[PDB]
């Protein structure tokens, strides 16, 4: 059977049960090449899929595109093909003054400022990572020598108003999000990104293990708009986290 969007079969994955899921299709080959025997499988829309071998075990690398909706398709279709563990890596904007560019964040829970999470569980349900995955990501990030923060991430369906950016075409933010950055800062939230609420909610409510690690490329107390080094370190960390998840 060949899934609707990803263009791969179960056989193509060579028994892989773990996927690393970056957002940018261009990052997929970079991650795969950190491992052994990388093989290009397919590319369609925002979904580029490779497989590789890590300590002799097959691993998939598959891009998600931006946002919960496109991520939800990739996760569902990979799960149909046997994948059970999902490691998200990406970039992020920090909102706490003490978090610096180049630091890494492992999400312990996400503020659900998305829509797709609600397609898996009502809002009351926590957007929480698998504890083993979060533990592996913390260990990999700390062992790398990075400065690592564990905490809550605000996960938004937009890059602009939902992250309270004003340098925009309208220069306006809807009532719901006015003052929201300060609110999240006061509540100890570490960072903004756009996929973790969907990923974590869908997996935690569907018997899949997931976690998120991100490299900080901007601090929103400094400016609104932004990283090559941070990105490179982040992907080395996620591969080491995958190594720790292998059985």
């Amino acid at each position: 059977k060949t899934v609707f969007h990803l263009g791969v079969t179960e056989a193509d994955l060579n028994g892989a049960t773990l996927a690393i899921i970056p957002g940018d299709p261009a990052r997929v080959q970079k991650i795969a090449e950190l491992m052994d025997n990388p093989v290009f499988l397919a590319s369609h829309r925002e979904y580029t899929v490779y497989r590789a071998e890590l300590d002799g075990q097959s691993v998939v690398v598959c891009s998600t595109g931006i946002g919960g909706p496109s991520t939800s398709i990739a996760v569902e279709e990979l799960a149909q093909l046997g994948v059970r563990t999902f490691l998200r890596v990406g970039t992020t904007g920090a909102i706490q003054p003490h978090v610096n560019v180049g630091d890494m964040i492992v999400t312990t829970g996400s503020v659900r400022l998305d829509g797709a999470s609600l397609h898996f569980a009502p809002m009351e349900f926590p957007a929480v990572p698998d504890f083993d995955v979060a533990t592996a990501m913390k260990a990999a990030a700390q062992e790398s020598g990075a400065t690592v923060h564990m905490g809550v991430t605000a996960s938004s369906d937009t890059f602009y108003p939902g992250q309270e950016r004003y340098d925009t075409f309208t220069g306006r933010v809807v009532r719901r999000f006015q003052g929201s950055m300060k609110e999240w800062q006061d509540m100890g939230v570490l960072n903004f990104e756009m996929e973790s609420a969907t990923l974590l909610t869908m997996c935690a409510s569907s018997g899949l293990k997931a976690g998120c690690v991100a490299g900080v490329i901007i601090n929103r107390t400094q400016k609104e708009i932004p990283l090559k080094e941070t990105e490179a370190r982040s992907i080395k960390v996620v591969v080491e986290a995958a190594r720790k998840m292998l059985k």
Copy 2:
């Protein structure tokens, strides 16, 4: 002055104030070549951007990726660079027995089963197209010979549970969406897709003109499988139609 995700500048757009926004980056060149002097501008992530000329006026073609969040970035960044009118095209399924594969749908309003629309306006606000764009799309669609339906589209943040698909890894659909397909069918909803609620709400609440036209490629109520010829013709017709709708908007 280079936008963060799309990687283009205002000067790159050569004065374009109208964009055609398909979902699939591979479709961008296909639309652009229906116009004059198509030129590739950039490709970053799911965003492939071309410029072209239609009746002597610059037009942008930019893919959106799947879903409201990635669409919202492309529309915002294009608006920063002067684009004011957005014509969405794609292919779609339909959920009504009277809508056939190969037909076209022009959305008159969207059921907001998304999240990004709420980042622009509260749920009470209608996800509705600009009337001139919807009118241009209907006319272009009819002129192509297609059977055209005007009506409501259900716009979902998921392809699977939000469209009440059960053929999935878990086979479960959360309470909110159980029975939802029949509910929308009984309310006259024509089809599902994944971007219109965000696009229409963002634009209608931000001073931008938008509309959506789609070719029907599956019908959730029909067991039969559409033949390859029909599907090929439908994809080609859809992009011919959106370019003709753009021509009507530039007049």
Copy 3:
């Protein structure tokens, strides 16, 4: 058959499948008399009902009263008696500085600041008109020589706090509506009225065709008390327009 509130039977309607539905019972006779052979049918509560003939076809004119609840009863009972198309005409207060007193507005979608719409479809569903009715109303309004705006209307269950009026007994507006007029202005909303969200949602989710056209009698950025001759001229033009829109809907 018979119905619970309107006091008319299917036979009374003489085969009418289209209704013009003003708010004020006193406007019913005025509208009917623009057509041929107007006949008074009944008056009970806020529901005054006439029949007339337009190009030889029976048309019913029925007042709705103020608000979604009373409108929902009239529409349901007219539908039980065979009516399938509903043309709303009324007065409105504009909220945009570029919309002048005496202009006309054809609603392309309503902000659902009502309660009755939720008795037909959840909030995500768009309060949008039938495209043919909206097209007919735009055409009739423009052909009359009026200045016509197509756009979003805020449809409120109250005249006072839900339209952010402070010159009231308490001078208070609940948190939900504080700052709301500025919010709708910034989102491009044209006007306030009190029935369109209910009417459009009910009809769009029930297989009925509906639209709304309105004459601007005040602008909220200006004064609250209309000038009498100006108001009379606007009201007269609005009912001429809605009758011409009905003519365009006849088959």
Copy 4:
């Protein structure tokens, strides 16, 4: 001092601080003639207004029309003209088997199945009557010889789906209201009507005293078509009761 809809001035009310507010404009004169020196003041739209005198004190009688939105206008405008106490009288459909046709109900709180109440207070706020008014209504109802029930009323923005009626044009009830009549029955709710949630919430949050008393004209567990003599008797007793409750409030 004038108001926008009711067409009366403060002077017209002759110092009245209490209003009786039936729904049907035709009931206004019937209530007024139970008092001294009734005088017609105005009729505009669904608002018919009379003044009268009760034990030497001026009282106003003003119809509300159907639903919270039209009720909210009348209450606000009467409050602008000095009215501080509002006694609602109206018909109702009981939903409990132990409540008989011809009984009376005094509402102790309303289920807010409306929209206009939210324009005065968020949903958490209780739609509850002034305790003095409820007490006066219970006493007046009992003194008339009626069987009187105190309890919760479900107050709906629709007559049809929000009261879970299926004998309608579509025969559908939106998900929110499917099974709702059984749910309210099991929660001890007595009856349905369409104005109390708005009236009680707006008054309780605005420093106005309000209450509602109603005669039971049908029981939803029985039949929808009332017997004429029984209904006539119930309606006559209801208005005698509300006038006696007004007398008690003016003591």
Copy 5:
């Protein structure tokens, strides 16, 4: 046979069908000793349970602890053992300048700023007392010589941010509650407490009779400190009043 939290059996209650339910376990014995033959039954967690006799009839006194969740367990388990009427007593802080320390408040409805009420009825349902209990409490309170206020109480799941207290560890109040005290004050709300929304909603939707009476021991709007004597007298009066209200409820 023995309820899980309260640790009592039906036989332990000696036929009681009425309970007085203070919050503080230390108050249970004090209330019981105002009646005849007080007998300690059990103490587990925040639940101290006594029985006593009032005019020859068995009455239960049972503490609830703080908050709706704790209260909901006590009410449920007592209802399993035959209790049908629940009289809540305590002391409270007022938010209206006209309410004085030493006055009594009888709740006519509660603002549902809790969570447990939603486990019995959706938010639309009114948190309202049984009319007989509220009537008995008003009579007992007035007969004591106290100044009594009938009105709305705001019932919060927190003591601190939900009552808009800023003198806290973080000094933060979440958006929902910023400005809320002034909002409730302007809407005429008398006081804050933490159990009535749950109690009243649970009982009103479950066929149980409930009400709440409280003595005012502090006023958020007055800067002075009440003296020890006045506070002592108010605490003593509140429990004498609830026992007299129980007397009025006995059949």
Copy 6:
């Protein structure tokens, strides 16, 4: 110098403690404190019994919370005012997964917010999640004790009965929101029900406090609704050993 409002202790009383163990039942406080050095009773008021003790030379406080988020929120706030920054919750729980056995322990990784008090600290979108260090310490302490330990999501309810979908109750009814909810949570992989974690974790995670929850399983809800009240002996003893060892790891 101040004495907090409910707990009746001062900062000086805590001897520099920055960590609290917070069981629900006041009777459990001494039992936990005696596992440490130099336990001393500080205060008891309402459901709040407070001891201090020393663990590896560091002062620790043990404070009961009572049942539910509202009473828990008071204790946490007042302890934080006195310098406490880390909170370790221990309690009992009902498992809802068939593979979880009586006597197992559960460390909560996130809570389903079926409470009300959490909303007084953060909107519903915010995750009710523990501090990662506390959860890590609790898992290690639990494993080291020889217990079978589960990490996962906990449903945290404002009621013991309908919010945990118990039907062996006075009404035998569960409100629509909670009908079928146990099966839904089971299908979503939720491990267990309790009543305080959503409030505790949300309050702390949004207020700069570290918190976690560990619970001993005393019933499996796939088997029956009510625990025997005897299996709560060995399970309780091991649970408090575990929470003290988790505290040791945090210091």
